[PDB]
Amino acid sequence: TVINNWLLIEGHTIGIGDSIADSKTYQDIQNTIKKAKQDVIEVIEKAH
Amino acid sequence: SLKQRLKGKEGRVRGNLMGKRVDFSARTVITPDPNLSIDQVGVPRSIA
Amino acid sequence: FRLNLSVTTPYNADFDGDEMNLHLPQSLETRAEIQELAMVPRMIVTPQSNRPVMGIVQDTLTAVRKFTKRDVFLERGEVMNLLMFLSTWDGKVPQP
Amino acid sequence: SYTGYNQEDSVIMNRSAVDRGFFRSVFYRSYKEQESKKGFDQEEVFEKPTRETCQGMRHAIYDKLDDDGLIAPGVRVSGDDVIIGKTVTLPTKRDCSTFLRTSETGIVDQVMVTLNQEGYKFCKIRVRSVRIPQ
Amino acid sequence: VTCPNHPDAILVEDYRAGDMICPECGLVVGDRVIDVGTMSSSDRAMMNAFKEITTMADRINLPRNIVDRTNNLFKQVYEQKSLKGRANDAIASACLYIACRQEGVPRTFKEICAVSRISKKEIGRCFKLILKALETSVDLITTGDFMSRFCSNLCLPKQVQMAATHIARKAVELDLVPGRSPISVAAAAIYMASQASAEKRTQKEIGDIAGVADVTIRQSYRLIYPRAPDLFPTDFKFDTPVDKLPQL
Amino acid sequence: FIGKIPIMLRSTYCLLNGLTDRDLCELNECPLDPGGYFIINGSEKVLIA
Amino acid sequence: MIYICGECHTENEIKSRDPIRCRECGYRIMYKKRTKRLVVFDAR
Amino acid sequence: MIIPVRCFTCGKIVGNKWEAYLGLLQAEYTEGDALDALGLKRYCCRRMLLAHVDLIEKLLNYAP
Amino acid sequence: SSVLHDEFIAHRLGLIPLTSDDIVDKLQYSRDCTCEEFCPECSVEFTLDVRCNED
Amino acid sequence: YNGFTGRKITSQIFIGPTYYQRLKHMVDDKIHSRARGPIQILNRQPMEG
Amino acid sequence: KKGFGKEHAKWNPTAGVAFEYDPDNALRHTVYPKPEEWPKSEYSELDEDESQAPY
Ligand SMILES: [Mg+2]
Ligand SMILES: [Zn+2]
Ligand SMILES: [Zn+2]
Ligand SMILES: [Zn+2]
Numbered sequence: 035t036v037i038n039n040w041l042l043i044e045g046h047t048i049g050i051g052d053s054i055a056d057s058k059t060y061q062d063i064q065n066t067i068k069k070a071k072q073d074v075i076e077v078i079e080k081a082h
Numbered sequence: 083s084l085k086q087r088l089k090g091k092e093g094r095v096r097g098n099l100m101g102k103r104v105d106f107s108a109r110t111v112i113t114p115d116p117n118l119s120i121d122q123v124g125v126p127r128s129i130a
Numbered sequence: 131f132r133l134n135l136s137v138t139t140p141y142n143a144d145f146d147g148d149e150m151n152l153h154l155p156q157s158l159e160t161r162a163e164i165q166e167l168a169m170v171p172r173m174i175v176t177p178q179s180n181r182p183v184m185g186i187v188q189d190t191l192t193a194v195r196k197f198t199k200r201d202v203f204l205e206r207g208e209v210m211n212l213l214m215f216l217s218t219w220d221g222k223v224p225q226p
Numbered sequence: 227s228y229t230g231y232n233q234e235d236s237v238i239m240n241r242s243a244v245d246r247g248f249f250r251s252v253f254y255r256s257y258k259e260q261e262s263k264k265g266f267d268q269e270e271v272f273e274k275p276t277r278e279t280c281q282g283m284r285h286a287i288y289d290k291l292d293d294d295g296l297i298a299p300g301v302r303v304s305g306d307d308v309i310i311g312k313t314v315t316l317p318t319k320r321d322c323s324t325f326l327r328t329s330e331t332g333i334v335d336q337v338m339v340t341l342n343q344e345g346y347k348f349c350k351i352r353v354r355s356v357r358i359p360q
Numbered sequence: 361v362t363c364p365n366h367p368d369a370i371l372v373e374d375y376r377a378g379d380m381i382c383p384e385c386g387l388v389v390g391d392r393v394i395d396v397g398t399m400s401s402s403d404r405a406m407m408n409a410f411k412e413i414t415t416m417a418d419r420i421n422l423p424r425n426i427v428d429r430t431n432n433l434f435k436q437v438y439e440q441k442s443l444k445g446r447a448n449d450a451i452a453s454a455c456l457y458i459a460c461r462q463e464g465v466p467r468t469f470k471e472i473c474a475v476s477r478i479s480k481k482e483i484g485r486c487f488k489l490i491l492k493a494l495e496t497s498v499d500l501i502t503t504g505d506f507m508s509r510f511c512s513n514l515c516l517p518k519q520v521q522m523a524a525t526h527i528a529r530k531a532v533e534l535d536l537v538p539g540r541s542p543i544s545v546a547a548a549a550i551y552m553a554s555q556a557s558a559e560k561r562t563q564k565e566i567g568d569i570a571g572v573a574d575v576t577i578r579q580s581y582r583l584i585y586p587r588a589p590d591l592f593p594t595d596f597k598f599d600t601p602v603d604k605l606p607q608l
Numbered sequence: 609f610i611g612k613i614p615i616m617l618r619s620t621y622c623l624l625n626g627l628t629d630r631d632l633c634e635l636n637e638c639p640l641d642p643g644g645y646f647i648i649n650g651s652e653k654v655l656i657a
Numbered sequence: 658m659i660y661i662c663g664e665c666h667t668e669n670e671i672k673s674r675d676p677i678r679c680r681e682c683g684y685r686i687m688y689k690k691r692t693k694r695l696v697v698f699d700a701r
Numbered sequence: 702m703i704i705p706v707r708c709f710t711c712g713k714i715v716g717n718k719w720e721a722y723l724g725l726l727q728a729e730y731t732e733g734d735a736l737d738a739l740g741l742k743r744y745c746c747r748r749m750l751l752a753h754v755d756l757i758e759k760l761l762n763y764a765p
Numbered sequence: 766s767s768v769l770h771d772e773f774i775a776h777r778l779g780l781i782p783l784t785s786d787d788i789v790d791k792l793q794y795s796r797d798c799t800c801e802e803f804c805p806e807c808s809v810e811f812t813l814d815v816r817c818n819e820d
Numbered sequence: 821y822n823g824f825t826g827r828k829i830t831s832q833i834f835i836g837p838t839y840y841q842r843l844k845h846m847v848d849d850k851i852h853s854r855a856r857g858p859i860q861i862l863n864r865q866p867m868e869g
Numbered sequence: 870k871k872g873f874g875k876e877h878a879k880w881n882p883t884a885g886v887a888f889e890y891d892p893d894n895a896l897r898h899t900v901y902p903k904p905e906e907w908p909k910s911e912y913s914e915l916d917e918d919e920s921q922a923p924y
Contacts, residue, residue: 037194037197038190038229041227042227042228042822043829044830046227050834098863098865104153105856105857107853108851108852108853111131111149111850112131112148115134116134122134138234146235245879246712246780246878284373293658301696336688337688340687354770356772357846357848375869376857377856377857378858378867393864395861396868698771700775701879712883712884714782714884745837795871807871831900
């Protein structure tokens with residue numbers, strides 16, 4: 035009871051500002067993903 | 083025949099002595115109500 | 131039918147179109163034995179794994195995590211307001 | 227999260243928007259009855275069963291029925307009302323009938339009378355009922 | 361069902377709870393007791409006759425409510441067995457003629473002959489025996505009952521069909537045809553009607569449909585012709601003046 | 609004569625084949641109804657592939 | 658009582674225990690006429 | 702089937718504006734302009750006209 | 766005999782706004798007034814009657 | 821703003837128009853109760869009425 | 870008849886009723902995470918290059 039009745043003073047939600055990241059982060063994520071893909075290609079060629 | 087009448091699932095022993103239909107029971111949809119205790123439930127007035 | 135959330139986790143319920151059966155004790159010995167054996171306060175901890183089955187759930191837990199930081203300060207008005215909802219309250223206001 | 231009444235897959239909804247037509251709907255339902263001659267003497271017929279002649283009836287009211295044995299459209303038929311009066315002749319007259327289910331509170335929409343495939347007279351009745359979100 | 365304490369003036373049956381309590385004071389005289397609502401020798405020939413009844417009814421092709429009573433009429437005729445020593449197929453055919461009349465839609469013996477081997481005379485003979493056998497009355501024929509299918513067989517529009525019916529109706533009310541078979545009369549009226557519309561047909565074709573001849577219609581026509589103009593309904597649209605109605 | 613075959617609605621052998629919306633509405637039929645089902649004793653039946 | 662044809666909408670009193678057909682149209686689907694006892698609604 | 706007489710959220714009267722919307726659009730006013738000229742502004746009252754399907758004009762094709 | 770059923774029209778009527786400028790203070794609540802079901806002291810009677818004849 | 825006290829809400833709420841549907845399962849159709857109702861005849865077990 | 874808006878929503882006399890106070894977070898009743906992305910209120914008295922009044 036007391037935490038619901040405080041919770042209408044504080045309030046809560048989920049938008050899509052809660053679901054996005056800054057460019058510095060996105061660029062770093064893209065860099066590592068590209069490197070991982072290249073490594074798989076190197077493994078494939080040696081097997082042949 | 084009297085074997086098929088006293089036989090298995092929905093017979094006279096698996097269907098009328100162990101499992102039987104009981105009077106005095108009502109079912110209704112559930113909805114929240116945070117103003118109740120744990121010890122309580124809220125019954126509508128037509129079922130009651 | 132209307133029930134408290136803390137009771138959702140034993141029954142494994144959710145409120146998107148479930149249905150729940152209710153049985154009514156008729157004699158007086160059976161109402162006494164349900165009262166002294168199987169009430170919902172008497173079944174908080176389980177013998178299966180010697181821990182409780184019911185704990186704070188859903189919004190209440192998130193709000194409690196945000197009600198108990200160190201930068202959270204309550205003015206006099208909502209101290210009056212929130213202390214209106216305690217059934218186990220002394221009658222005394224704690225000094226801030 | 228507003229007051230706790232929308233926890234664990236629920237929704238709070240505006241009451242004074244429901245009063246302006248929000249998500250209001252209607253609900254129709256039809257019933258069939260067919261008079262039949264199952265035997266040479268056992269014969270059925272649509273008629274208004276009278277208390278002293280017919281015998282197997284319940285004490286429910288039979289005033290809404292017309293002379294034919296069917297309810298004219300427009301009346302407000304509630305639960306446990308009789309809508310079709312069908313009497314069987316006894317080898318005097320032993321009446322049957324059709325009653326509503328419980329808790330309908332409908333309004334009789336329209337009544338149709340015609341002949342089905344094997345040529346027995348039969349009728350269809352449609353009941354209208356409005357459903358406001360709750 | 362009897363209570364020692366007091367007399368029972370009324371015992372309502374509660375359909376909803378499947379219960380029986382007595383209103384005047386109250387007592388379940390009965391609680392939870394009311395539930396809430398080659399081998400064939402006989403008629404080997406009768407059994408086959410109803411297949412043959414069905415096989416006879418099938419040719420006419422119509423909702424067979426007439427047939428079930430035809431089956432019960434025979435069953436009844438069979439049971440008395442006063443007329444047992446007679447041909448079954450004639451009785452079946454006679455049962456059939458009767459049912460159509462019993463349904464208020466008789467079919468001509470001529471038609472009934474089409475679906476059976478029995479002479480019209482033997483059907484008529486058997487018919488009277490059944491009337492006597494089952495002791496039941498009949499009804500008189502009306503022309504309009506055959507206005508529908510014949511005009512249909514000619515694909516004549518309702519207006520002609522309905523006009524004919526009035527012409528027929530007016531003619532019989534005036535008895536312009538004393539003793540004349542209403543079949544030949546209806547047909548001449550139909551002829552007159554068809555002759556009053558673009559849908560004209562030769563008497564022989566009509567005669568062929570009514571199962572009669574063209575000379576048979578010619579006489580009946582001669583009897584109705586004097587009143588050809590006035591016999592028509594007030595709601596009609598000529599395709600040919602009554603003056604220009606042919607003579608034969 | 610041999611017998612009678614059911615007819616799938618809106619086929620080339622139905623009474624509604626190649627009609628215009630002014631006539632489909634005149635027989636109390638919906639111009640948007642797709643067709644492709646049978647009418648058997650009042651009911652509407654559909655065949656599953 | 659009084660019935661309404663399903664095609665031409667011409668009212669015609671059909672007597673008890675009588676065949677079900679229109680007149681001037683020859684049709685076999687009849688609709689019963691609306692009642693004359695009055696029922697009141699709420700705009701609510 | 703027919704334009705509601707009141708917006709479900711505000712309560713502003715929206716029923717009388719249906720014919721006008723068709724006319725302004727007919728005049729080739731772009732939809733954005735038409736709504737503004739009618740005077741609806743809040744995006745709860747614009748949803749009323751922007752997303753309305755008029756089924757009453759197709760039930761008037763069946764003879765009574 | 767229109768396309769909408771009876772309870773559809775009874776609902777689109779209640780939401781029509783009536784001029785309530787000055788005579789709301791002279792009207793009793795129909796549950797307080799000492800009259801019968803209705804009287805010109807706690808009510809106002811309307812009437813509609815339309816018939817379509819042209820095509 | 822809060823509707824009961826008119827105060828502002830500390831968080832900002834995500835609001836916008838969406839498209840909802842009304843399913844067929846209504847509650848007027850799923851409520852039922854029994855208390856000493858009609859019983860059968862042969863086995864005297866509770867029966868529907 | 871006569872009534873008010875607690876009976877039914879056909880008896881209330883008003884469309885939307887706007888209301889607001891403290892157009893700039895001088896009291897910090899609401900807390901912006903990034904106070905720069907928020908449009909300035911219609912009633913504000915701040916400069917064009919400010920976000921909130923000082924607490
Ligand atoms: Mg679930
Ligand atoms: Zn007609
Ligand atoms: Zn609005
Ligand atoms: Zn009054």
